Amino acid sequence: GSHMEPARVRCSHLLVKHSQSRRPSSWRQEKITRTKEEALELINGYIQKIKSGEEDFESLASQFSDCSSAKARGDLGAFSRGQMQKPFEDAAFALRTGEMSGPVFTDSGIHIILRTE
């Protein structure tokens, strides 16, 4: 008598892209020439800060996300399943209040998912 995964969850997301993509363009830089390994270093760097509580995810997502989502704070409030990608959904809906998925690798870049609520 339980629901298969939550129906709606709130999770904030950060996106770091890399050269290997169909569009290596950012809002803070023209051509993203950073390779995957460089992106990994960046991602892991934030992942540690998020656990230790060095910098706030909202501030990170609003600055380090190559996507326009940075200006959207990085948070999308409570979202349903049919709003996110398959890998994102699996990770986001598997995070409880305080959990962080980490590096979600997609073709459009690496997404960091943190359960804010």
Curated annotation (Swiss-Prot):
Judging by the UniProt lineage, the source's domain of life is: Eukaryota
Listed EC numbers: 5.2.1.8
Which GO BP annotation is one of this protein's?
protein peptidyl-prolyl isomerization
The subcellular location is:
Nucleus; Nucleus speckle; Cytoplasm
PTM description: Phosphorylation at Ser-25 by DAPK1 results in inhibition of its catalytic activity, nuclear localization, and its ability to induce centrosome amplification, chromosome instability and cell transformation. Ser-25 is dephosphorylated upon IL33-stimulation of dendritic cells.
Q: Write down the top EC class of this protein.
A: isomerase
PTM annotation (Phosphoserine): residues: 25, 62
Instruction: Give the consequence of mutating residue 25 to D/E.
Output: Loss of peptidyl-prolyl cis/trans isomerase activity, nuclear localization and cellular function
Q: What does this protein do?
A: Peptidyl-prolyl cis/trans isomerase (PPIase) that binds to and isomerizes specific phosphorylated Ser/Thr-Pro (pSer/Thr-Pro) motifs. By inducing conformational changes in a subset of phosphorylated proteins, acts as a molecular switch in multiple cellular processes. Displays a preference for acidic residues located N-terminally to the proline bond to be isomerized. Regulates mitosis presumably by interacting with NIMA and attenuating its mitosis-promoting activity. Down-regulates kinase activity of BTK.
What is the name of the protein in this document?
Peptidyl-prolyl cis-trans isomerase NIMA-interacting 1
Task: Provide the species name.
Answer: Homo sapiens (Human)
| Origin organism lineage | Eukaryota, Metazoa, Chordata, Craniata, Vertebrata
Q: Which gene encodes it?
A: PIN1
Q: Which portion of the entire protein is included?
A: 51 to 163 of 163
